[PDB]
Design a protein around this ligand. Sequence first.
Ligand SMILES: [Cl-]
Ligand SMILES: [Cl-]
Lengths: 301, 301
Amino acid sequence: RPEIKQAVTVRPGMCGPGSLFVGQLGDWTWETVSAQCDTDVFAARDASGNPTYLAFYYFRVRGGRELHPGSLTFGDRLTVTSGCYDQGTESVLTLHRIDRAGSDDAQRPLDLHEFYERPRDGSLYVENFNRWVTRSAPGSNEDLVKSSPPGFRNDGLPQLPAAYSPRAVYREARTAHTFRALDEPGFRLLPDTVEVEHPVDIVRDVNGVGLLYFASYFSMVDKAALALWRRLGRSDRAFLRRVVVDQQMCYLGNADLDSVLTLGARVRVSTETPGEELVDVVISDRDSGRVIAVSTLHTQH
Amino acid sequence: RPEIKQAVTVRPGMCGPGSLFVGQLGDWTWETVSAQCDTDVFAARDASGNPTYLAFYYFRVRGGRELHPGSLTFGDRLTVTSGCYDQGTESVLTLHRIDRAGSDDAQRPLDLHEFYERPRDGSLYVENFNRWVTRSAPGSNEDLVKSSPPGFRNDGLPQLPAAYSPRAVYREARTAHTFRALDEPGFRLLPDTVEVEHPVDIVRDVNGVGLLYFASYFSMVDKAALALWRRLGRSDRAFLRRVVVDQQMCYLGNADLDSVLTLGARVRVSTETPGEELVDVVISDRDSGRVIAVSTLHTQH
Ligand SMILES: [Cl-]
Ligand SMILES: [Cl-]
């Protein structure tokens, strides 16, 4: 299996202009997969005894003006509905819908059509596509290898039709370096861009197993975004006021803890709605020749 | 009421060399006080309708070689025991003991004597002393004012004897700028110190209500500590390996989101045990003339 409903009171540890909300989202994904695929995701190991991690690969957060991540304050009552979909033995799709606890029809079950074609204002839709991986060498964060812990059961799971394919979505972003095609009408590109050098921050960016922490990617993207916001003369206070109505992240790789990353950012402004923009950020590990992440944010000023 | 026992599987969102574990600790304090003092801490308001926050004031984490925060990895099974103690109507003390789920006598209730005079190796002891506050002016983070939400019930709570007084502990650290008196025998002070300028990081340091986030203070301290670790030639890899067996933080103030903070750090090395040190960090808001935090860490290299 059944979907997992929970009543959630918003805590300081899962809101604010940082990456704490996304961190909460991923911990619910690992809990939801554990419950539905008969596997202790937290302590997962492959037959050798190697630890295997249910790594974040594609991550979407979509809301809108009436509920977005920046709308959440301490003490807000929410309803969270969660469940997995079959993507075979090495990968799994986890969905989360978040509603205000009061709201009309908050009890409704997950609905792929709603998530993928008819998103409602006032609901927050989370898509986490995750893939089992292991280190290819102790202490290396490069060249992660595909895994599946023994006993991972995808068989119970509901099916996704071919139209809703996280795989397609991420393949196109890896190629284009945005999740919103550069020729969408109704946008024009500004000439101002930034390229920020970011040494891995070993106090804030690293997780419990010595990999870069998946929520830190959101922090790196917001750092590149802030830099651009600043390069084009806007205020720190207005930055804290931006409304992020949609954001997608593809995790192409991890990195070693001494790497120097590069954070590239660009923005397109709406020619219809004032103050609506698309910001694209690419995170590179120049030294290994890899793009390790791509993110697009859809914002209202 | 009764103490709150929970079985906890360690998640990526509450471990690692960052401040995520301390963030988890504070969310359990707010849940524990909510349960024992009949108050929704998350959504607390005073009679006017002003939001009132159960602010972190004094924070201790004490473990040891057999269990410290850096010992926790994904999937670890823990037992957590929590409860509040009466400190009147404007403040409350919350204790948490954390044991490995397997261990001898993990079911035992909280014991003030154990916490304050006989801490056991293999247990982690958390002390959170918190005070209700409100903003004195919309959008200001300075000059917070004492509060108590209506209906806060400290009456149920067990009593603390005069010997165990968080108040005394913090008063001495505010004066001395360490929690370990400068004349403790068995330590000598190194001449190397650092002073790091730290503009408030609006993507990573700010909480859901626009105040500096209490766990960010731990990140700022670790930044000042890393700087010192580096100034005296040690490796990033060895920094990730430090064992923090005790840490205390006093939160003297908050700061506005455009402040530039100063992070001061010093270290004393053991003359008995090799590789045991005390690192003291002071966080200043030069421009308002305030010390906003003091922290001492007891480490094994
Ligand atoms: Cl992670
Ligand atoms: Cl906080």
